[PDB]
Structure formats: structure tokens, C-alpha cells
Symmetry: D2
Subunit: 457 residues, 4 copies
């Protein structure tokens, strides 16, 4: 249909099939498709998700123009995504003025100030993690990181968001953990979403049937569960409180539920998935593991409890986290819908085009990264951290729509790692997939789950 | 689904049925439904076209706020209408910045200046009208106005828009008149569009099938026919010329076709339908007919040819046209889609609500019109024309999005009537529907076509 | 659209709304709508589920013609039901020759012979039920029947179908009980299915998206779980065995899964729901409870273990079960799609019409039942059991497509009750809904769950 | 989805793309795709029209089994085709018992008896054809066959079906010819129908919107036009009469309209298209033209008027018609939907598979035709006509569902040619496309229309 767009504008790209566009090229996943296109075509290129034209861009100035400069004017929203039901009101999903309102109503929740107050509560579930791990370190049986990390990551969420306090690894069947684990980061290469991409005219069909990519049952569990806690604390420290206090243009109650749902997933599969990637890289590079175990003990001698300030003090820890996020940027791509005919850094961009930054492919670009497949934390030494274009390395996005939970996500993940490297070491098992292979699907996740050996220090 | 909207906001309205909303109430047509609601509920009210909330308003200040004040800011577009294909680019159909561009690129086409230049060509087809009529005035057989007026109205269009010059009543089968008559003002109460209103999620389905409410065949006839005339005049006075000269941000070629299509219908069924309504009212009020025949002869003695200036000179003619348009405002309603949460003249209007002015019901409101059903031209005497709220009487809309062809449409219609009342008189026949009954459907048209007796002066 | 059908044929019925047909009348549920129509219109009547014409019939001969006589010829299948995915192959859902094959391949599974072999295994979980109950009979706290019965009913299913052996009330979190409880008898008056009924043209839309009214996750759990047990028993007494042996025109493996799913639900919510209804009626009619506790002890003195033969010996037990099923026939209606133009017992029935028997309304018809709302088991005394038209009383359907699991369902339910009335008695609590109110929705279930007092004999 | 079908059954075919199946291979049209598959794969093969599995077959016994033997049992209907509206009732479109009824109610209309009675009326419009042609034979200007033949072919239809009698080439604008020319043989490779094939789940969507591949306006013209003529002849020789007499299980009135529509097209574009193909082959093989002009004059000396009997007498005329139909079999393919699991001539054919005979590819198969691209009428000499497998050469189909109008179509076409070769000869013009190229689309029609020189004998 609209498959002449890039051929006119003089932008190169893979030739689209009728109806499908270029989607059959996703058979190795977004990341691999993005790398190929980068090499085959250079700095800019175009392709079609069904009839949806997508313009990839790799110029840091141009990227900065889209993500920062012209964000409010032209590139305000992300690719429409449906069917979502009442989740239209989630911040990550909302548009234009509604999003601007929600970003405001929700920003002070994520300050360095409020973040320092969540430390002692986040500190408490680190210790729960250790005990579950030593039960396996004392029973010489290899460990799947995702289960134990997610048990931890969930434990922090439920708490930092509603006060609920479960040992999700040892009380995994209590009514709360059941619903909350039923979140699934959406495989955009799964049967369902490829059908969307080729039949996006079916989203409104599904919307009028109250179908939701968020299971209609988990949402109902928390919609009421919030209006219980809402009326329990009212009247008699967490995200809900910080959002309830805000509605005192102000936030509504079902909007509040929707943000709660986004926050819960946000820090579940993500925090847990990033922790897994770090632990893998640690186990397969044992020296880095040792160098970090030294710094954790120098700043916190005698296995001293990590504090907010001791965490920012640690610099090799930061380097490890960053270099992991370079090799596994869980978002893979950034995207904005171009809402007006515009011209940025010398290129005409018509209305409706989705503009896409290929984060995974830029993190692995040899034109900016020496030995880009190698896990080498020193790239982020304060000697070299200045050489790195913040518009090439973008694991949390950028501009007015970057990751709202970035600080919290780094803090949470580091508090988990300080505590864990104070007590154990991590070894490849025979069953450990080395080298790790990324799922060919639509998520940045390992093909096989990560299994390692855990020895008690 | 969204059927609680007005019940929350505290706006009264007829209770909606699931899925249908209030559409079953259209069984007497928009106009009658609008009158009822006006009386039942007062100054504002709400209802649902399927799941689409519609807020009717009748305050002239509030109407002025929507149609003029906040037009560019909030109320810029009309109710989405599909499937349209390439006709998305027609001015009457286009949105936001695209419309603003098209209104600019097309405005100077409709000036008092360019309009004075179309007079002598529009004058020529008036004489064709007379001859066809006297062939019936000399053959004592009653006449259907729509056929003879449309023959005339078409004759002016084809000319004033492309130079083509046919006697569409006597050369009705030439290739051009066949396609051009295949326009149909859309019965929004017909089977098809009621299905849209209850399944608007099916428009995108139909759009991806290249289905068009404008027959895919007539459009193809003129798409090429334009790019012929385009390349005939280039290189070797009408709307096409005025649009071709404009593309010399500038107008494209298929956009040019689309405007051509809108203009052709615009002045066909409308001009012809309004002429019919005037002739009816004239025949059933013979004194008004006489008073106007006197003024036509005082300004143009000896059946003098009407000129642009002699036309504006005529004031009872104007009164007749206006008072007809009061009783038959062919648009019935005006509408704008509310693009932001706003508050106008003290009422909150949420995003997405269609705001509707019920022109037909306001033209017939006894709270502003004495004996409103009576055809009484003197309402528009220069003694009384000042008493009339331009926000109650709105046959051409208002504000930046009023009828672009208003001046031309009045001129064309008056040039037709001066010539015709200079030569004939018009009498009720036995077959004449008295009093006229409006089609219960979705157009302002007579139930039965208007048949009259035509006697040669 | 097709809303003239019954008006032509001369069959009376409620006047249908456009698009909706008569569905708004479901606001009190099928059962109440059926009763009204029966009284308002008499022996036959028509109505529209959207555009779907439905002919209700209440003549026992005519009912026998449809359900038995012309079953194979004309009335072979049930109302199309979608989207179902691979569940198209379930027996209860399948059509024409495929169903005939599946009914054959699955019939010997349900014989009096094989049924006598399942007794000792079904006997074992009765004792599990007692212990869970006395833990509540010794802790003076009222009991919700559905939870304790479903715990039991599940326990029998998992066993009688796959050998799996869980105390689902005390091991409720083991991986098997989680998936298996995620069956939900479909509320055909819920948002989703009313949308089907008005947009049945959307089923094929949903089918091509691999959407399934059976959650795509539970099905995957058992599809593989079967092909595990399949390859565990092969090679090294239950329904799976009886189906695996059958494929040794023969049954396939995914067909086998689908039957497994139908059987699991079939005996879960149903058996458990019917048990609840009996216990309610028992508690609110304490004499019937006593009369039955006497017969259970006469045939099984000293709390003797019930056997297959001792179960059929018990006749007042049968009367209780039957009279409960009269007042709560969980299917509510029977239905067949008329596959040919036919004429049965003097009435023309066009192709495509769904023919419906209103079981609930016939069970409550005063023209066949004295004091029909009264729970009076003696109606089914061997003195009166002969007076009862098997085409008026139809809790298991009739003809070649009656309930395949009828015998098993009666046996299972009676083995549960003999054991339970041998040990406890059942008393109304203050919280007990008396009289019970049927859910206004699309299932025969109580508005409020049934809570009773349980005292240890 | 179902794209494993042929890979399992062990049938070879082109590998299908997701969603598209093999449809992209239609870029050279069905005929060319069919030839390739025949050569690449042999006697049987499979492919996918979207998700629709299609099994091509080329064994004459197997073809006879499908088209004749198992027609009523298994292969009764053609590939579902929609949206059709009330045209569901046309015979060529109807299914199962409804079709069997319509074939009966309509068969005696097409007998050798009734056909002999239509001769003198069909004879009359032959003479109209001559005069229009000599007006061009006397004005040395090349002639487009389709216009002049269709003018003739229409003239015979309107007459033989309703008595209406127009000179459609010289009265082409009368109200009847306008609607009747608005039939269009459907380009199944046009945008619309390829969208069906990939979204056949959208047919029911369109059916519920009263959209029709037969324009909703032409159908309305004749629905009423029939019920006028119906009530004009009733009460005060053609197909309508023969159908009206039949309803005196019997035919209804709107069914009657629908058959009328099928018959009108059937003999319009087809008869006219076949005539064009013959005239082309005649002009480009001048000896065949001469040999036939001799036989026409031997049987009809002195330009004697052809009679029914003189027509069957002519044998080289028959040979010409047949050999043309070999090279241009306007149906291209025959098709039946397999309604049951069956096994025919040693191959398993699952339910739902469309079984397709590739007539065009078999007519051009070198394994049955010497020099198959050559136009050589002698193939059909009574010496060689016996060598020809009626299951390889199938321009009118075969079995209970062959072309109902075959005899009439041959008669009509031959009466046209006898008259025309009695008076003119036909010569290539410079503008004549030699060799003719078949439209790459979805019809058997020439790329360019056929233009020839016409000289008066
Ligand atoms: C290591 C873990 C995480 C990574 C790598 C990450 C990365 C990202 C990225 C790349 C985006 C899009 C940014 C852009 O488009 O410019 C994003 C958006 C977002 N993130 Fe995260 N994120 C992480 C964890 C979290 C957490 C814990 C939260 C908790 C609240 C969170 C909340 C959000 C929200 C609400 C958005 C939408 C922002 C908006 O649209 O206004 N994320 N994240
Ligand atoms: C007596 C005849 C006519 C009447 C009563 C009439 C009335 C109207 C009305 C009520 C509107 C909507 C105005 C609003 O929303 O505020 C409109 C819009 C419009 N009219 Fe007319 N009209 C007539 C004839 C014509 C003619 C001859 C043309 C020739 C070009 C024309 C072109 C248009 C266009 C293009 C629009 C869309 C304006 C825009 O969206 O920018 N109309 N007309
Ligand atoms: C007290 C509990 C139950 C009741 C009241 C009941 C009632 C019914 C009814 C009314 C039908 C439709 C019959 C007809 O259309 O004529 C049916 C069908 C069916 N039932 Fe049950 N049923 C019960 C329990 C079960 C159980 C335990 C099974 C276990 C396998 C089962 C399996 C089936 C199947 C497979 C069908 C479809 C029959 C076919 O289409 O061939 N039902 N049941
Ligand atoms: C030279 C011109 C024609 C050719 C080559 C032709 C060929 C065919 C073919 C191949 C079929 C399908 C047969 C099969 O599936 O086995 C068919 C069906 C049919 N034809 Fe023709 N035909 C011609 C002219 C006509 C005419 C003039 C009529 C006039 C009534 C007609 C009426 C029909 C009908 C009604 C069917 C559907 C048969 C059924 O489904 O029962 N055709 N034709
Ligand atoms: C007639 C019957 C009650 C069997 O089916 C229907 O009414 N509709 C036709 C097909 S969908 C009902 C379907 N439900 C279900 C199945 C699996 C998981 C969850 C729900 C079904 O067949 N269940 C078996 C059954 C139910 C009741 C009595 N006996 C057997």
C-alpha cells in the first residue's frame, strides 16, 4: 500500500513484501535484523512493519534531536500499542498532554531524595536472598538465577510499591505472588503481536471486546486490591502512598492502579533479567568478579551493610553494571511516532513515520566499540567514561521520555549485588550455556536460562 | 462502554442502549430528533452515536467559542468519516495542519475578485436552462425541478471547474455527465453508515481494502481526466486553472483531484437542492414570486442580463434565498471534534467528544423565530436583518471552517433565479406535494420530488 | 437483517431490536427469559440472538423428534461456538462425521463395566473429603460447599483421568491443581460472549489470531503433560489409558488432549456445583436429610463402605439427586442447529435456525409440576417416577447426543454423598442465603456461594 | 497456520509464505502459475491461497471421479465466494440441496427443444450486427471486436431473457443498457479479491454490511424491473417466462432475479469474449477463415439464413470454435470443495481442501497436444475428435455441474459467426497485437483489445 515511501524519499532499505512489509526478516529477532541493516545500509534506513513505515537513525545529533530537542514538539509518543483497555492510562503507554500530566504527577516519586528513603526497606530483602541462596550453596546443586533473582526482585517491588512483605521464594503461593508473577514481557515476535503488525486494523476490533494484552484477571485483582489498601491506610513510604498523597489535573484512582501495574512489571522481569545477565558475565569472567569483591569489602569492611552513599561510592560496580547494559540493553530499540511533517539535521521526515533508534545495534557497533562483543568493564573507567557518546550508549533512553525508574533500578540492582558478592562466589556449571545465546524471539533474554554454581564465602 | 460520560458530567440526555447508543432515535431523521432533544432538555444535552458521545449545544456565545474562538486550538476537525481512500486529502475532510494548508492553498480561488470573473460564463448556462424549460412550458406537462436545476447546476460546475461545456439535459449521455452524476450525497441514515456508527472499528478494516464511499470508478475517471487537462492546458479561468497555477507546501496533483471532486458535488446536489426548495416556496407563496419578479425587472428592465453588481443590488432576492435556507439548511448540523480537555463558557468538555450545533433545530426554534414554520422573507428585511443572531442562523457554518464556497454558491443560485423569473412563472400542479415533507432519512431533501407548473411569461 | 423470519412463518415472539435482536432481554438471565416466553407465548416461539434466529419448542414429541428421531439427519450439532482453536476437536464441540467418530471412539470409556472399575479409586478420595470437613466440624466455623466439594471433585477427576493423586484442598499449590482450577464455565451473559452474539462475524477474526476461549496457557500445560504421561505409561485404569488404548479412523494425540480437557471441566464445576445444590436443599429441608441418612445406614450398616451395587440399591438417594437436578439443571437449555429445510410434527423449520429446548423452564412448568418451586423428592418415587415425561425432565439431554458422562456423574456424586451423610449433618448458618437466588448471569450458580454449618455425627 | 498440510500428506508444492501462502506467485496470473506447477511437480501438487489449501489434479480418471463420480457425495460446491448478498441464491453460487433444487428448476430452460425456439429471435440481432459493421467497413477505420460483439451479445441476452429489444450499439444510452453493461467479470488478481484471499475472515464482516461484489445499484434496477415485467406479462418465449412458468420447492421471486443476473453476465462478457478470440484467430490464420467461408456458403447458398439444423450441420465451424476454446478456456480452472474425508483413485483428500483442475494448463499440455500453442482446428476433425480425452479438454466443465448454458452459448456464438462470415472478411491492422498477449491479471482476456480490419464481401 504505502510501500513506496522510502523509495521516494531516497532512503535505502530491504524491499518489502505485500501485506507483510519486512516482517519475515524478524526470524532472527529485532537485534540481529537491526545489525544487518546497520551494516548493509549505513547511517539511516527504512523498512515496514506491515504497512507501518519505520525509519531507523544512527546519528547522535539526529538522535538527540528526536529524543530531546523536538521531543515535545514532534516526537512525543511511542508506537501505538494495543489492545490495552484501561491501561491506556499507564504513563509508559500514554500520549501527548495526558502523558505530560502523568510524568509530572509521578516524577517526584523517583527523586534522589525519596530514593534514599527506600534503602533500608530494600536492604531487608537482600538478606532474604542470601538465606535462600546458601540453602543451595550448602546443597551442591546448580542454581537458576532468574528464579532466585526474581524472587528477590518481586520481594522489593511488592514492598516498595504497597508495603506487602512476602518471602516469594518460600511463600510463593500466597495470593499476592500468584497474580503478580503472571506478568509476561510481551514477545513482540510471538504469534499474537506479529498478527497485530500485519492487522493493526484489528486492535480497535479487540478494544471493543474488552480484550487486553494485560490479562483481564490480574488487573481486576489489583484494581480492587488498591482500593482496599487505599481505604486501609486512609485512614490509619511506598509508591502507592506517594501516588495517593499526590491526588490530595490531579491523579485519579484507576489511573493510580495502572501506574502500579507498569511499575510492578517494570522492576520485575527487568531488574531480575539484568541481574541475571550481570551474574552470567561475572561467572564467565572470574577476575572481574574478584576485583569487584575487593571493592565491596574495602568500602564495606567486615561485610558492612551497604548504604545509599556507600553505593554511589562504588565505581567498579558501576562499570560492571554499565558494561552489562551495553551488551544486553533490555529495551533493544527506542521509538517515537513523528507527529508532524518535519526536517531534522537535514532530512525530511513525513508525518506518521515511526522513528527508531537501534540501541542494541549501536551498543555493538565496532565503529564506536573496540571488540564490541567482549565484556570489558574498563570501557567505563573514569578515564574512558568521558569518551562515550550518551547518544550511542542509551540503555535508559534519553530526553523527557527516558526511563523514569533509572536511578531506582540501578540502586535496587546494586544493593542486591553488594550483599550477594559479600557472601558467595559464582562458578560456571557444566550446564551453563557458554557463550550465552540470545533468544531469537522478541525479548532480550537468554535462549536457555542461566544456571551457575554458588559457593559460600 | 463509555455510556456513563454525560451521566457523570451532569448533562441530560436520552438513555442509550448498549452498542446502539441512541441511534434508534434516528427513525425520524436527525432534524426531528434534534428538535425533540431541544425541547425535552433545553440549552445543552448529550447522546451517543454508538459508543461516540455527542454534546449538542445551543448557546450563541458557546457556539461562537467553538466555531470561531477556539477553532484552531480545540475544535479544528469534523467527526472522523471513513472509508475515504485518497479522499482523505479533500479539504472538507482533512485535519489539523493539512487542512490549514489546504484552506490557504484554496482560499484565493473563492474571492470576490475571482468570483466576478466567473459571472459571464455562469451567465451563459442560464440561457440553456430557459430553452429546456420553455420546451416544457410549451408542452403543458408538469416539471420536476431537481432534473432541470441539476442539469443547470451541473452545467455550471463542469464549466467553472474544468472548462468542459455540455448541455447535460440534452447531451446527458456524453462521457463526462455519466460519471459526474454518479455522486450521491450520503444518506447517513442509510444501511451502510448506521453500520459504521455502530462498528466504527470497521473503517480501518475497509480502508485496508481500498474500499471507498466515493466509488472507486468515478474517482479514477477524473484522476486521469485531470492529468489530461493538466497536460492539455500546460501548455497552450476555472477552479482547476486556479489550482494548477497554485502549485507553481505547494499543492500536489492527487490533492488537486480530490478538491475537484469535493467542489463538483458541493455545487451539484447542493445548489440544485437549494434551487428546488426556493422554487417550491415561490410556487406555494405566489405573492412573494410576484414581488421578486418586479424587483428583477426594475433593476434589469427589458429582461436585462444580470451582472455581478446588479445581483448584489437585489435585496428581496437575498431575503428569499436566506429565508429558504432558514427553513432548509441542507447541512442540518455543524460539528467539531474536541481535541483537548477544555472548558468553554463555564462547561467542562472532555477530549474526544463530538460537539454538535443543530442548525435545523435552531432555524426552527420558536424562542428565536416567530411562526418559525412559516415562509416569511421579511424576517430578512434590512429593518429586521439586524435582529438575527449569526450564531443561531448558520446555513454556511461559521468561523475559520465555514463554507468556502458560500459567496459563489449564493451568486450561482441567484444568477439562475434572476434569469428564470424573467421568463416564467411557477404554479402548483395537482401532483405537487403541499405541504412538502422532508425525507425521514439522512438528507435534507423532499420525501417526493418537487413537481410544478411552468408558464411562459 | 433476517429479523422477519418468525413473523413470516407465523411463530410468535418478542420483537427484536436492530443488531441486538432480543439480547437485552437476557438481563435477568436465560432461565428467567425462557420462563416469561413460555407463559407469554405458549408451546413454540421465536427470538434472535443478534441476527441468529432461535426457535424454542416445548412439545415432548417434537422434542423427541429433534433430540432422537431426526438427530443424525437434521439436528446433529450444537450452536457454533468460537473461538476455540484446537478445541474444535473436543467431542462436545465437534460436528457431523467428526463427532460421530469421536462419540464412538469415546463411548466404551463410559460403560457400566468400566464404571464399576473406577469405584474403589473414587471411594478413596471420599475419605479425604471427610477429614478436611471434620477439621472444620471441630472448628465451629461455617463452610463454603463449593471449595470443599470442588476440592473433592477435582481429586476424583485428576485421578480417574490421569492417575495423578493430590490432596487439592491441602496440597492446592502443586503444579497440577493450579492449571486445572483455571477452567471457568463460560458466562454466556458476560461482556465477551454477548459481543460474540452481536458480532459472530468476529469469531473467524479471532480464530486467525490463535485466540482461544480456553486459555492458551492451560492447554499447553496439558498438551505436553499428556505426551509425558503418554510416554511414561508407554511403556511401563483411567480415561487417558482408555483413550490411549483406543488409538491402538483411530484417535490422534491432540484430539486425545482435547477430550481430556472437556472431561476435566465437565466433572469439575458441574459435579461440584450439583453437589452444592444438593447440600443446600438438604440443609433447608432437614427431614429429607434424616430420611436419607437412615437409608444410607440400612444399606451400609456400621458406616459400611459404599459399593457400586449398594449405590444403585439406594432409591431415596436417587430421588434426591433427580429432584435437585429438576430445580437446578445446570445446562439450562438444550440446542441443535437445523441443518436442512425440514418439517417435524407439523411445523416448517428452515435451515440455519437454532432449535432450543428450555430445560430450566420445563422443569419449573406448573402444567407438568405440582408446586414446581418446592423441593419435594417424592415426585421421583417409583410410584410416581412413571408419570414423568422423559422429554420434559431432561437434565442430561437426550438421544444420540445426551450427556456421555451421565452414569459416571451420578455415581461420582452419590459416592460422595453416601460417605458424607454417614459422618456429618448440615445446618443453615446465619450467613446462608435462604432462599437461594440464582445468579442473574449466564450460569446456573447461586448468586452468593453456599455456606452451611457442619456437625460431626 | 495450516501450512503443513501437503508437507505431511507427501504432496509436492511451492513453499508458502506466512499469511500469504503462495499468492505472490500470481504475479503472472493463474494460467502461467498453473503451467509452471504442472511442469515443476507433475501429476498432482498443492499450494495455499492464503491459509486455503488447494490441491491441483491432472489425472483424467481422478478428474472424472471429482467432477462426475463423487460430485453429489463429496465435491458438490465451488470455492466459497463472498460477499454476495442476495446473490447467495444464484445457481452458479449456491450449495448442496439448494443448488440441486435450482439446477432442477432451471434445467428445462436449456434443452435442445427450447433452444430451437430461440433461433429466430437470435437470428434477428445478427442482422443488426452486420449493419453496424458495414458502417465501419465503408468507413476504412479499424474495429475493436469487443465493442461490436458485446453490442451483439448484449442484444441477444436482453432479448432471450426479457423480451427487451434495443440496438445497444446505436441506442447504447437507453436506461436498460446502462445498468446491464455495469457487470464486470471479477479480476480475482485485482486488489480487492487478493485481500479476500488473505483475509477471508472479512467476508462475514462485509456480509453484515450489505456490501456486495455485485453493485447494490444494478441489482436493485433489475429486482424491481423483473417484478414489473412479472406483473406486465401476468397477465397479458424467453428465460424469464420459462422461470415464471416454473414457479407455477418451487422458485421464488428474488431467486428468479438472481438467476437472471447470472444469465445476463454469463452470456455477455463470455460470449462476447469468446467471439473476439475466434475473430482474432481467424484474422491471423486467413486460410482457416477462407475454408470456413466456403462451408457457410455450401450449406447456406446465396447467403441463406442459418437455421438450427443448418448450424449443427456445419463441422469445420465446430472445429474452429472448439480449437479456440482450447487456446482460451475462459474459466481457466475448475474447482470443487471437498466436503468429506475421502480417498479417490488412491490418494487421501482431507475435508476442506479445494480441489482444482487447471483447464488452461491442460489445454496447453504438450503431453496431450502437438504444438499446443498453434491454432490448428484439424485437431477436432471427426478423424481426430475421438482421440481427445474429454477430461483433458474441458471448456464447459463436466459432470452434474458443467456449464448449464453450453448448448445455448455454442449456438448463439455460431449464429453470430455464420452471419458475419457471409458478409465480411477480417484482416490484421497495424495496431493488431500479434501475437496476442493474455492479461497478466485474473481473467482470460487479451492484454490489449483486439482491433482488426473489416472488408465488405
Ligand atoms: C535495568 C532496568 C531498566 C532498564 C534498562 C530500563 C530502560 C528503559 C528504557 C530504554 C525506556 C524507554 C526510554 C526512552 O524511550 O527514551 C524505559 C521507559 C520507562 N521505564 Fe524503564 N528501565 C528499567 C527499569 C525500570 C524500572 C525499575 C522502572 C520502575 C518504575 C521503570 C519505569 C519506566 C517507565 C514508566 C517508562 C516509561 C517512561 C515514559 O514513557 O515516560 N523502568 N525504561
Ligand atoms: C447553498 C449551498 C451550500 C450550503 C448551504 C453550504 C453549507 C455549508 C456548511 C454548513 C458547511 C460546514 C460549515 C461549518 O462547518 O462551519 C460547508 C462546508 C464546505 N463547503 Fe459548502 N455549502 C454550500 C455550497 C457549497 C459550494 C458551492 C461549495 C463549492 C466549493 C462548497 C464547499 C465547501 C467546502 C470545501 C466546505 C468545507 C470547508 C472546510 O472544511 O474548510 N459548499 N458548506
Ligand atoms: C451432574 C452433572 C452433569 C450434567 C447435569 C450434565 C448434563 C449434560 C447435558 C444436558 C448435556 C447436553 C446433552 C444434550 O444436548 O442432549 C451434556 C453433554 C455432555 N456431557 Fe455432561 N453433564 C454432567 C456431567 C458430565 C460429566 C461428569 C462428563 C464427563 C465426561 C460430561 C460429559 C459430557 C460431554 C462430552 C457432553 C457432550 C456430549 C456430545 O456432544 O456428544 N458431563 N451434559
Ligand atoms: C463460451 C461461453 C462459456 C463457457 C466457455 C462456459 C464455461 C463454463 C464453465 C467451465 C463452467 C463451470 C463448469 C464446471 O465447473 O464443471 C460454467 C458454469 C456455468 N455456466 Fe457457463 N460457460 C459459457 C457461457 C455460459 C452461458 C451463455 C450461460 C448462460 C446461462 C452460462 C451459465 C452457467 C452457469 C449457470 C454455470 C454454473 C453451473 C452450476 O453451478 O450449476 N455459461 N460455464
Ligand atoms: C452441552 C455442554 C454443557 C456439554 O456444552 C455446552 O453447553 N456448550 C457447547 C460447547 S462449550 C461447553 C464446554 N465447557 C468447558 C469445557 C472445558 C473447559 C471449561 C469449560 C463443555 O462442553 N464442557 C463439558 C460439560 C459441561 C456441562 C455438562 N456436561 C459436560
Amino acid at each position: 500500500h504505502s510501500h513506496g515511501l522510502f523509495k521516494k524519499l531516497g532512503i535505502p532499505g530491504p524491499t518489502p513484501l505485500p501485506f507483510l512489509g519486512n516482517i519475515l526478516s524478524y526470524h532472527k529477532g529485532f537485534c540481529m535484523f537491526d545489525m544487518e541493516c546497520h551494516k548493509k545500509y549505513g547511517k539511516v534506513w527504512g523498512f515496514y512493519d506491515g504497512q507501518q513505515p519505520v525509519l531507523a537513525i544512527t546519528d547522535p545529533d539526529m538522535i538527540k534531536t528526536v529524543l530531546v530537542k523536538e521531543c515535545y514538539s514532534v516526537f512525543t509518543n511511542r508506537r501505538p500499542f494495543g489492545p490495552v483497555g484501561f491501561m491506556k492510562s499507564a504513563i509508559s503507554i500514554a500520549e501527548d498532554e495526558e502523558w505530560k500530566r502523568l510524568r509530572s504527577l509521578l516524577s517526584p516519586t523517583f527523586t534522589s531524595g525519596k530514593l534514599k528513603e527506600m534503602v533500608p526497606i530494600i536492604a531487608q530483602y537482600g538478606d532474604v536472598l542470601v538465606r535462600n541462596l546458601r540453602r543451595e550453596a550448602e546443597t551442591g546443586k546448580p542454581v537458576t538465577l532468574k528464579d532466585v533473582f526474581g524472587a528477590y526482585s518481586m520481594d522489593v517491588i511488592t514492598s516498595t510499591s504497597f508495603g506487602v512483605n512476602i518471602d516469594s521464594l518460600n511463600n510463593p503461593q500466597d495470593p499476592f505472588v500468584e497474580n503478580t508473577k503472571k506478568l509476561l514481557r510481551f514477545d513482540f515476535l510471538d504469534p499474537f503481536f506479529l498478527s497485530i503488525t500485519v492487522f493493526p486494523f484489528l486492535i480497535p476490533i479487540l478494544e471493543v471486546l474488552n480484550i487486553c494484552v494485560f490479562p483481564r484477571e490480574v488487573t481486576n485483582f489489583l484494581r480492587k486490591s488498591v482500593k482496599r489498601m487505599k481505604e486501609s491506610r486512609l485512614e490509619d513510604v511506598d509508591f502507592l502512598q506517594l501516588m495517593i498523597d499526590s491526588q490530595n489535573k490531579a491523579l485519579s484512582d484507576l489511573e493510580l492502579v495502572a501506574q502500579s501495574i507498569i511499575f510492578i512489571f517494570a522492576g520485575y522481569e527487568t531488574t531480575s533479567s539484568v541481574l541475571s545477565f550481570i551474574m552470567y558475565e561475572l561467572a564467565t569472567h572470574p577476575d572481574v568478579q574478584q576485583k569487584l569483591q575487593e571493592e565491596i569489602d574495602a568500602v564495606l569492611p567486615n561485610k558492612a551493610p551497604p548504604t545509599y552513599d556507600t553505593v554511589l561510592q562504588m565505581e567498579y560496580l558501576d562499570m560492571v553494571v554499565n558494561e552489562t547494559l551495553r551488551l544486553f540493553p533490555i529495551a533493544m530499540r527506542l521509538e517515537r511516532v513523528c507527529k508532524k511533517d518535519v526536517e531534522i539535521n537535514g532530512m525530511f521526515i513525513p508525518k506518521g513515520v515511526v522513528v527508531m533508534i537501534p540501541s542494541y545495534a549501536l551498543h555493538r557497533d565496532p565503529k564506536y566499540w573496540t571488540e564490541p562483543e567482549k565484556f570489558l568493564p574498563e570501557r567505563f573507567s573514569k578515564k574512558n567514561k568521558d569518551n562515550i557518546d550518551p547518544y550511542i550508549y542509551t540503555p535508559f533512553g534519553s530526553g523527557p521520555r527516558n526511563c523514569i525508574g533509572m536511578r531506582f533500578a540501578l540502586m535496587n540492582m546494586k544493593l542486591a549485588l553488594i550483599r550477594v558478592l559479600q557472601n558467595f562466589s559464582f562458578k560456571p556449571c557444566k550446564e551453563t550455556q557458554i557463550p550465552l545465546k540470545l533468544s531469537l524471539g522478541g525479548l532480550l533474554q537468554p535462549e536457555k536460562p542461566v544456571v551457575l554454581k554458588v559457593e559460600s564465602r
